[PDB]
Design a protein around this ligand. Sequence first.
Ligand SMILES: CC(=O)N[C@@H]1[C@@H](O)[C@H](O)[C@@H](CO)O[C@H]1O
Ligand SMILES: CC(=O)N[C@@H]1[C@@H](O)[C@H](O)[C@@H](CO)O[C@H]1O
Ligand SMILES: *[C@@H]1O[C@H](CO)[C@@H](O)[C@H](O)[C@H]1NC(C)=O
Lengths: 89, 50, 50
Amino acid sequence: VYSSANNCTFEYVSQPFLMDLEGKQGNFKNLREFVFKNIDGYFKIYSKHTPINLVRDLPQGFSALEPLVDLPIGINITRFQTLLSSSGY
Amino acid sequence: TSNFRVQPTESIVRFPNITNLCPFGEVFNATRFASVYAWNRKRISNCVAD
Amino acid sequence: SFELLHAPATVCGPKKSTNLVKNKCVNFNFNGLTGTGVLTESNKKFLPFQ
Ligand SMILES: CC(=O)N[C@@H]1[C@@H](O)[C@H](O)[C@@H](CO)O[C@H]1O
Ligand SMILES: CC(=O)N[C@@H]1[C@@H](O)[C@H](O)[C@@H](CO)O[C@H]1O
Ligand SMILES: *[C@@H]1O[C@H](CO)[C@@H](O)[C@H](O)[C@H]1NC(C)=O
């Protein structure tokens, strides 16, 4: 409906987080785990991106997520929204 | 009777690089300066200010 | 106009660096991590974010 901020506190541009596509033509769907943290003055994101054969629930395997970004953004994060047959999240 | 320790000679200071260097051209080089009735404000962030 | 509030600083001066001295007892500061000792080539394989 609207499309203007009239502002900019901080801006960052890099490689896409979600568009890591490999292992097609099979049951290997890319499970994209993310962890979002809000600490004193920083917003951290961790991720992995692992192909799995079972798509219904979490794979029950084990791996750790690696640091993706660390942004010096001093804002109040209290709520969040995800923007988007229908596997969902 | 005593202890000894090898002392340091030089010192090493290492930082990644100098990136996102702040231009400041927008305030010192720009030709279209506003007058006092409508002076301009430029915000500086995420940069190295030399 | 400069301000200090509580948020992490995003504007800073350049961080001057020196050369790298190996196989000698030196003082050092690597990206904020200080200490003393002798630096040698490592056979350790750090992950890209470590
Ligand atoms: C058009 C507009 O909303 N401008 C806002 C201003 O009202 C606010 O006081 C200031 C605080 O930093 O941030 C600006 O982006
Ligand atoms: C405001 C501004 O940027 N003035 C630049 C100065 O910084 C630069 O050092 C010089 C060339 O040496 O050329 C001037 O036009
Ligand atoms: C905004 O943050 C301050 C402290 O950072 C907190 O006291 C306040 O309750 C927060 N506002 C909301 C709506 O949560």
